[PDB]
Amino acid sequence: MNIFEMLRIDEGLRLKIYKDTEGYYTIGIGHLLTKSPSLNAAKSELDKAIGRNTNGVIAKDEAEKLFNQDVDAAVRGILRNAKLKPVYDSLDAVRRAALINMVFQMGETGVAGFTNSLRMLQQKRWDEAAVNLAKSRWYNQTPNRAKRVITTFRTGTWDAYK
Ligand SMILES: [Cl-]
Ligand SMILES: [Cl-]
């Protein structure tokens, strides 16, 4: 297991524009296109992102490419973020994948706001961080995915994904 296979399990793959859990237009492997209600603003962003007229549909290779960019951007955002970087540096390889997953799902800004959990993770208080991470809208809204991520942080193994 690795970050790519982990996120592929959590996000799935769709080749036609769809709405995410929040009702936003997405395509491929959890690639947010726009928060706007307009399917046309979605198709526009989509064609901008692919560099071709897609009519709302893309190929597998195209989805994977967006995915490669997105993971990369997620890592780079963590490394550039003054609050995230120290946490990431302090973690083992598995736990690092758990943080990247949160960042990809909710953005740097959102994760960065989990102040107390971040501090518990840095301190390696696994059980306590897991309890604190659960008191969040995130956990309440996508409980199955949240539990998997949280188990990854508590355990340091890929068990939740096997
Ligand atoms: Cl893009
Ligand atoms: Cl879920």
Per CATH, the architecture is Orthogonal Bundle
Q: Which ligands are bound?
A: chloride ion
Rg, please?
16 Å
The largest sheet has its strands arranged as 1-2-3
The count of β-strands is 3
Number of helices: 9
Estimate what percentage of residues fall within beta strands: 5-15%
- For the record, give the distance between the C-alpha atoms at the N and C termini, rounded to a whole number: 9 Å
Q: Report the major sheet.
A: 3 strands, antiparallel
Spell the H/E element sequence: HEEEHHHHHHHH
Relative helix content: 55-70%
Shape: elongated
The CATH C-level class name: Mainly Alpha
Structural class: mainly alpha
Please, how many domains?
1
CATH T-level fold name: Lysozyme
Main location: host cell
Active site: 11 (proton donor/acceptor), 20 (proton donor/acceptor)
EC number: 3.2.1.17
GO molecular function, one term: lysozyme activity
Q: What are its keywords?
A:
162 residues; mainly alpha; Lysozyme; three-stranded antiparallel sheet; 9 helices; 3 strands; elongated; binds chloride ion; antimicrobial; EC 3.2.1.17
Your description of this structure?
It is a single chain. This protein has 162 residues and is mainly alpha-helical. It has one domain: Lysozyme, CATH 1.10.530. It has nine helices and three strands; from the N terminus they run H-E-E-E-H-H-H-H-H-H-H-H. It has a three-stranded antiparallel sheet. Strand 1 and strand 2 form a beta hairpin. Helix 5 packs across helix 9. The longest helix has 21 residues. The protein is elongated and about 50 Å long. The site of one chloride ion has 4 residues, from helix 9.
